[PDB]
Design a protein around this ligand. Structure first.
Ligand SMILES: *[C@@H]1O[C@H](CO)[C@@H](O[C@@H]2O[C@H](CO)[C@@H](O)[C@H](O)[C@H]2NC(C)=O)[C@H](O)[C@H]1NC(C)=O
Ligand SMILES: *[C@@H]1O[C@H](CO)[C@@H](O[C@@H]2O[C@H](CO)[C@@H](O)[C@H](O)[C@H]2NC(C)=O)[C@H](O)[C@H]1NC(C)=O
Ligand SMILES: *[C@@H]1O[C@H](CO)[C@@H](O[C@@H]2O[C@H](CO)[C@@H](O)[C@H](O)[C@H]2NC(C)=O)[C@H](O)[C@H]1NC(C)=O
Lengths: 72, 49, 23
């Protein structure tokens, strides 16, 4: 139901989380089309100790690498 | 199987996520159910009893 | 794959604000 990154729950903006066994993905409801879980597909709300069934993963922020590599 | 069995064959889905999706369908953010699952379950149990 | 696609450019808002300031 949710993915924890830094002690903060992440919920899908529009879609359901999915995993093929090793990695996690976010995809629409009526057609299989996995996408990488970023900060644009999820919205943060709450903390990491209220939701039942949460899991662990890391959300890829496109801002971080693309901005730190150039700013050096 | 939720409401998906009315289109074709039954499709699996856990009940709490189906309830969250029904909340999402009426303009309430889906985090509300996951933050208040036990309270809603108790309210439903009291109402149906 | 799409039939009818045309060429154009998309404006990125982050690039000007970044390279103008981070330089
Ligand atoms: C589940 O999906 C992941 C994501 O694509 C798969 O990981 C890829 O595996 C291939 C084959 O070894 C690699 O070439 C890719 O580099 C992997 N992706 C990444 C991001 O590292 C994984 O194999 C899939 N698992 C199953 C059982 O299908
Ligand atoms: C997700 O990752 C966090 C971070 O490691 C896990 O929290 C740890 O839980 C173990 C077992 O309760 C503790 O011994 C560690 O001290 C915790 N980490 C910290 C930094 O305090 C959490 O358990 C993971 N989620 C799951 C479902 O295993
Ligand atoms: C949109 O731009 C691409 C590349 O900028 C065009 O593709 C080129 O088309 C010419 C036409 O003969 C070829 O000689 C080049 O080799 C193509 N380049 C590549 C990278 O494929 C494309 O034609 C443009 N679209 C339209 C409708 O003109």
């Amino acid at each position: 139901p949710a993915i924890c990154h830094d002690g903060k729950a992440h919920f899908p903006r529009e879609g359901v989380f999915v995993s093929n066994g090793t990695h996690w993905f976010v995809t629409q409801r009526n057609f299989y089309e996995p996408q990488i879980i970023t900060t644009d597909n999820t919205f943060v709300s709450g903390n990491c100790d209220v939701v039942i069934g949460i899991v662990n993963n890391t959300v890829y922020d496109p801002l971080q690498p693309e901005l730190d590599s150039f700013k050096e | 199987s939720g409401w998906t069995f009315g289109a074709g064959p039954a499709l699996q889905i856990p009940f709490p996520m189906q309830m969250a999706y029904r909340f999402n369908g009426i303009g309430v953010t889906q985090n509300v159910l996951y933050e208040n699952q036990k309270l809603i379950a108790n309210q439903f149990n009291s109402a149906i009893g």
